[PDB]
Design a protein around this ligand. Sequence first.
Ligand SMILES: C=CCOP(=O)(O)OC[C@H]1O[C@@H](n2cnc3c(N)ncnc32)[C@H](O)[C@@H]1O
Ligand SMILES: C=CCOP(=O)(O)OC[C@H]1O[C@@H](n2cnc3c(N)ncnc32)[C@H](O)[C@@H]1O
Ligand SMILES: C=CCOP(=O)(O)OC[C@H]1O[C@@H](n2cnc3c(N)ncnc32)[C@H](O)[C@@H]1O
Ligand SMILES: C=CCOP(=O)(O)OC[C@H]1O[C@@H](n2cnc3c(N)ncnc32)[C@H](O)[C@@H]1O
Ligand SMILES: C=CCOP(=O)(O)OC[C@H]1O[C@@H](n2cnc3c(N)ncnc32)[C@H](O)[C@@H]1O
Ligand SMILES: [Cl-]
Ligand SMILES: [Cl-]
Ligand SMILES: [Cl-]
Lengths: 660, 523, 634
Amino acid sequence: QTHNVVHEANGVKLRETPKEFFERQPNKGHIHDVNQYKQMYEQSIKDPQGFFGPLAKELLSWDHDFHTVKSGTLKNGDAAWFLGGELNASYNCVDRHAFANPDKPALICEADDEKDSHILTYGDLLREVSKVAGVLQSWGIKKGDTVAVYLPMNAQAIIAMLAIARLGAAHSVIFAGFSAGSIKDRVNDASCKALITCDEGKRGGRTTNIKKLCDEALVDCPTVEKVLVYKRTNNPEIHLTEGRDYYWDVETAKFPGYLPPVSVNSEDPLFLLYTSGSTGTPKGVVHSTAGYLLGAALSTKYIFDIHPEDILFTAGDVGWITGHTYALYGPLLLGVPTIIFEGTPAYPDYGRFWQIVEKHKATHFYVAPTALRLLRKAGEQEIAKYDLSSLRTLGSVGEPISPDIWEWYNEFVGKNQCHISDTYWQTESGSHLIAPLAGVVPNKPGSASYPFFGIDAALIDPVTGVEIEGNDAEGVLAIKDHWPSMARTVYKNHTKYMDTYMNPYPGYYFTGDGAARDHDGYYWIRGRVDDVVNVSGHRLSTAEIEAALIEDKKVSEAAVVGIHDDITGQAVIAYVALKEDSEGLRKELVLQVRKTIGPFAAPKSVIIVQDLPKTRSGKIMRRILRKVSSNEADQLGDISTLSNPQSVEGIISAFGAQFG
Amino acid sequence: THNVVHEANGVKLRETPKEFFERQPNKGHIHDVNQYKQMYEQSIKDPQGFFGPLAKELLSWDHDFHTVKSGTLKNGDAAWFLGGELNASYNCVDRHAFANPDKPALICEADDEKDSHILTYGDLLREVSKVAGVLQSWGIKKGDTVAVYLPMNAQAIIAMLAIARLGAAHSVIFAGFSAGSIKDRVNDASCKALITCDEGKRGGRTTNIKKLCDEALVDCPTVEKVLVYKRTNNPEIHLTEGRDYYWDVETAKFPGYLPPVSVNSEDPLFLLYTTPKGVVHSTAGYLLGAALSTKYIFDIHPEDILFTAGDVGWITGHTYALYGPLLLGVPTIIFEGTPAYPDYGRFWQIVEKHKATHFYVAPTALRLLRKAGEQEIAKYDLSSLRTLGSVGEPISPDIWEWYNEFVGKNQCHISDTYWQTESGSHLIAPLAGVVPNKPGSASYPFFGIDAALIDPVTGVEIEGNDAEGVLAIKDHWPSMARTVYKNHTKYMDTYMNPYPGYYFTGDGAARDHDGYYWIRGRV
Amino acid sequence: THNVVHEANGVKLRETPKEFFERQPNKGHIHDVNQYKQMYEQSIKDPQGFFGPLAKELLSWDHDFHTVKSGTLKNGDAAWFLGGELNASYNCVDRHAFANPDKPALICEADDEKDSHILTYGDLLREVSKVAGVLQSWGIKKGDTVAVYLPMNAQAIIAMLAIARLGAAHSVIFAGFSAGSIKDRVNDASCKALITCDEGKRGGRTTNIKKLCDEALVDCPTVEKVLVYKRTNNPEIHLTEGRDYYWDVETAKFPGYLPPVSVNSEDPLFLLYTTPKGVVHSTAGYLLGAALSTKYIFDIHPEDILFTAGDVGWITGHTYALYGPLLLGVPTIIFEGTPAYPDYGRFWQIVEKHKATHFYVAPTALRLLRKAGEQEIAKYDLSSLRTLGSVGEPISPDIWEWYNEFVGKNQCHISDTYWQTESGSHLIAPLAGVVPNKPGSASYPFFGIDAALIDPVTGVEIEGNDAEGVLAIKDHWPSMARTVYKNHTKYMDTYMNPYPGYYFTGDGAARDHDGYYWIRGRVDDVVNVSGHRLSTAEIEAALIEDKKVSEAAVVGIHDDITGQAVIAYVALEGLRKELVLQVRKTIGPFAAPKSVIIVQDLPKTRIMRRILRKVSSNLSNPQSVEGIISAFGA
Ligand SMILES: C=CCOP(=O)(O)OC[C@H]1O[C@@H](n2cnc3c(N)ncnc32)[C@H](O)[C@@H]1O
Ligand SMILES: C=CCOP(=O)(O)OC[C@H]1O[C@@H](n2cnc3c(N)ncnc32)[C@H](O)[C@@H]1O
Ligand SMILES: C=CCOP(=O)(O)OC[C@H]1O[C@@H](n2cnc3c(N)ncnc32)[C@H](O)[C@@H]1O
Ligand SMILES: C=CCOP(=O)(O)OC[C@H]1O[C@@H](n2cnc3c(N)ncnc32)[C@H](O)[C@@H]1O
Ligand SMILES: C=CCOP(=O)(O)OC[C@H]1O[C@@H](n2cnc3c(N)ncnc32)[C@H](O)[C@@H]1O
Ligand SMILES: [Cl-]
Ligand SMILES: [Cl-]
Ligand SMILES: [Cl-]
């Protein structure tokens, strides 16, 4: 009843799924009740062969059957699923649905300005994906190649990804907010032979540069042989390099509306998605084909309760894993329409999300708490203008959801009639790890609830490294066996992969997160233990920001840490020591970060100090910057172990004077 | 009586002669003209249930197909037997070599009969594997294109099959093309290799073959290597070192068997140019069309011998001098010479020599033997023939009767086959021993071909019989060309955009009160 | 009593010792010699119904085959399991790793025992996947060839399987070959990559490996990249920037699983050079022969442990140190060293250490151990042994008795296995526990091997027993080599054309009244000109009897009309007619050379007829080559 460790769970009223959820459910639920979920979950752990075997044969269409469901171990980093099987991602996301119902909506595309919105059916999607795949084929793209995509969140980004996967190549989607430098680093690490981009973008009604940044990056990308450019704005002033750049519309018009998909092995790579960790350089997280697709389909169907009649609106960007799995692969695998929103939640006004839901009668809505906090602050008044009664599942992703935000989400968006799915997962997991199945698992606001099929979650004592038995516990969140959609490697750097996920806690997968498990088995995410900073849902590398600040010849040393933020969840604070206007130089360093990484990595604040605290070796002690960036300087303790203990006073004074 | 189709007024139906059935080795494939319409209507109304089983009957698959038909004419995305895999050379050679290795395959009649030979299916498999082994050794792989510039002899048939054995597309270039026309076709397809010969023989005279390639290859950088056959063995012929190699020298280095390479149903099988436009044909669709029409329009049985007096530089040789016959495991006669060499009885010496059962030629040759070789027909025995075919042109009702009595002796069936390179196989033709004939008429459309007439002025389909207009088809068919290489726009503007929802044949035709279609020529 | 096969007179048949069956883990795969003949007769008369089921039993298929057997010897187009697809590394590694990943796979005994180690099947899958991942990232793919120049250790086995995992064909180059011998083999195969090590250790001595490769690679432009294993980690071994990369550095970048690539049954699995000729073996047929012979001739069960004391540089290591044992899922002992280092007991210390049940070695090694180390054998417990194999050469009845007594303690079955590189697997051998032995005889032909004796003058088959002649085979078999790389005409001229309708082993043999075969010496020069078998050595002697000739060299070359033609080069127009009559008088009318070319001097080494053959078709004194090319044209 009472918890001594997991205080979040004390006196928390369990929240059953509202009765209206089942009234709006088009068919019988995919799972009967929570007891059937526990029985199925236990088979997915104890007998993954008999559990995932049948599900893989139901939900995916195979070109060659698989002979072995599961292989390898975490400790040896050789996980594999559905071995010997062959399939194609674009066939399972497009072809098979187009043959069955070519006129069914596939991509419900809401542009930055609604006047530019349009809907592609599955038949439309097959023809356009076939044409792009025909261009890439004519250019020499083939199984084993990588192709970069630098596109906003619109139809062309989806078509590019599916066209690449149709040939057996792996796509590497580069979020449209990345700078030229970040584009360069990602294209070169993957040795991409081609790039798919557009001339310009539309964001909040403003024209954004896209091709311009690519040209800047491509000067140092010798592997890129040809570029496909979509005329998003058709601006005649956008230059194309003769012999390298070609127009989407011109080249697709040369090839037919059907191209055979290329069968690939279950374990052939489907895509690279570069991610930021505690290292200084982005790591290309590699996902398999069959296992990743199955996880996407499984979680989308069972956690969100998706039926053929439903319509999913994932308010994410394909530049991130959320868009990968739940705006593209998840929905299209199940054959339902997915809403691809190119704009922002604030344009033309803070009701846009709800105008879209009402316009298309979306049944499922998936968004990050950062957006919920913004609409609670600036757009609560807009909600009453829209009919949101078509909704029944409300998802939350990317970061902790406050109990308060949970209630606001539940009341103002769901009218206290929808099921909320707080989905915990990460880029490397491919799909949901811990989440309340819609209509099945009752909720505790702020808790992700139970682990999903194939996810044998555990807590590890951070002092002893041994697994913690029993409930009312806390520790490092780890997973005891691999699962179908687990990332298989870091591109051309499997040693970093092993050192990051498998070697820290041998026999386990290290999520990088801490968590707690209450007496009912519900998991409560406590945050990253590895000091990875997550700003507005964007996973960031503090080391990458430190490197950017140092490129400025004026900076001698820099240290970046994360702190709580009422708006972005977390914010990065940069401490800079100069060699030697203070407000002017502070703006110069912030712009330096925007140029090298991107606008979304810029520090919320730059604190200029005379000296950083260090060890007797000379290493910077960021632990002191963290306790100061929060009002916990009284917890720094004995600092006589520092070589420069006198610097601590200046750091407390500088932070108090310059943080604002 | 007809008010529109003036060609139809007073034309007596010409039932197939009774002697056509005495010479049939087995019960015909279709009983009467009535059953043909029960099969035809199903092929229009239920293409999935009609062509699906036929595809499994006539072709051998390495991977089953999951969808029989996809796409529409309006969107130029037609596809057949999606998901399936197969290999053209396996269906034309391997599977018959295993069953009967010694059965004849290529009955080769050279320019001089003194150089005529024959290749059994066992021989053909060994010769195609060795040439394919050469190409595989050179780096030729699935997705490449290989040009052929050869006369009408064994080497051309082997070259096409060897190229398809690796899953590459062969682009055949008629041996009577100029170096310019050669350069244009090779560069459009970016062919990595070329198969030709030192020099051919056309009616006694020797023709410059390699000399024309060399003049053209100087503008074809994509060509890495050339395989040269010794048709005459002339030493004065120059082979550029490091590029040109001898057929016999390279094939001697490789074994008599090479595994075929599986290709998807919709992987291109060949480019064939008509600025020249490269007509691209799929693999499964085209092959099925070739075998179906060969089986039902000509009434080909395993015991039959087809003599298509055409050249593989054109579609007629593609479909009915190579693929059509060999898919059915029957022998086909590859004639390199001319109808006048040694004299105007060569066609008849060959028919008599090999007891050919089927003959297939264009009316252009009929007008040459009508006005020069009408007498040589009686010297030779033409009693083996059952079906006589016309192709390429409209056959004058004059020439139809001449072709019937002089060659057919009033005892054979005549089928006026109408079709284009873009159709892959026969569009409208009378079936042997099924469809009665009207001299000069193509008669009824074939399975899966939903013929229609369109008023050119309004663009609206003309209903009811006794009408004329632009000939168009209402749905795509398995052997329909899928695109024009690297130029699908020209493909849409030519065939699909003139009349959306239809296939523009480029011809004008008329349909009389009996449904018999009369081809009135190009528009 | 025998009037022809004198080896068989008074030879006591030697039954399999009772201890053999006591140590046998399960019931034997064949009950008795009577059951063996029933199976053998089906393998000859009905290979479709015999090998079909066995291929489905012993091999794992990615695509089913539609035809068990195709082609003929006469046409050199033999093929088995047509339309089938599989992967060699999947059948040797993956499927066993899934079933029991901790089962030992490669028991590796290094030159110095301190460096020995054991790889499980799970270990092997990870290491093969990683190397295959390095090669894949380098662009190696189906249809490529990859050279291996490695000692007999884990890296050689891993390299071969990693190459086969991508559908490329490996070409193993014995680590003792010189730079020149490496050059010829890499260029004939146009290998795109090479896998080697910095230095080797053999008998405690450091051998140069990379140094010889660098020397050869300067003239091997097809090699794009080299993978170098740190066997000694000698810091002075130079690596060329942009071409050479370290095994450990690159494998660390890639995951422990990589999908295998399906290949056709008849796609080449490997080239093995022997001018060196690249013997090409198929995939499906070769693997089936390896598994079949390993299982039935050696009597291999899942519980057994095989020690083939051979080198992967030769076919013996290919078939019976790697493919045979791993296909059946058993551990195989990979010995890097010599039988004398650190001492002459090493072979027996290894058998005792790992309780090997099967031992396979060539008589050359047995003679050495009998001469220098007989005393050491009794120091070790060899009671785990049950099958003793002999390969590569005749085994004397005396050496057989010594082998049987001192190694086998008169308790083991001996399998004298006759075969050759081009046969892929055993041709004639006594099945362990089934066929009783006659010392020195290979006994009965194996499944699918229709052995016969043919008269070497007429090529006609010899009926009945107590006979001797050319050992030939009447039909092809699954593991028969398919060609010589890019030189199928030499293949045909060597194996299929000398005795049309037969496969020519090059060996003589005799068949006694019990049907046992006794391998005799090698057959001499056989040139077949319009059916007349000729001896080039016999013609040279006749030309030399002419006092005008100082030296003479006769060789054979392909001929489109007469099959083969002999060309005589003479070192000293009218005299040319005098020499031809001399050959007709002393040898026979049809033995005259097609042409006699008079030269100033013949090539020699220390006669190099390999040069004369390549000249008649289009060391020491290299300048003489110019004059012979002009003389042949004159
Ligand atoms: C919750 C907010 C969602 O919208 P927001 O992140 O503002 O991005 C709006 C649109 O612009 C693209 N985009 C994002 N950042 C940039 C950027 N920095 N430059 C260009 N395009 C960008 C982004 O991919 C989508 O298509
Ligand atoms: C899923 C999209 C974001 O992926 P990625 O950029 O890799 O960030 C993953 C991390 O976000 C947190 N996180 C994610 N979801 C939650 C969640 N539902 N509750 C709390 N923290 C969360 C948690 O720290 C995790 O390690
Ligand atoms: C159709 C009538 C038969 O005679 P004709 O086509 O003129 O030539 C017969 C033979 O010569 C080839 N051939 C055709 N035209 C030329 C030509 N112009 N140059 C070289 N060879 C040619 C043709 O492909 C076959 O192998
Ligand atoms: C198939 C052989 C040659 O193909 P190709 O060179 O593309 O020419 C096809 C065209 O020739 C006419 N045509 C062809 N055959 C006939 C025919 N049998 N009757 C009337 N016109 C015909 C008709 O115009 C058609 O569109
Ligand atoms: C397999 C080992 C070596 O293969 P390879 O190098 O190709 O040599 C094969 C030859 O070795 C002899 N030979 C091989 N095994 C025996 C044997 N068991 N008895 C006698 N001679 C033998 C016989 O001459 C044969 O043609
Ligand atoms: Cl099942
Ligand atoms: Cl702390
Ligand atoms: Cl040598």
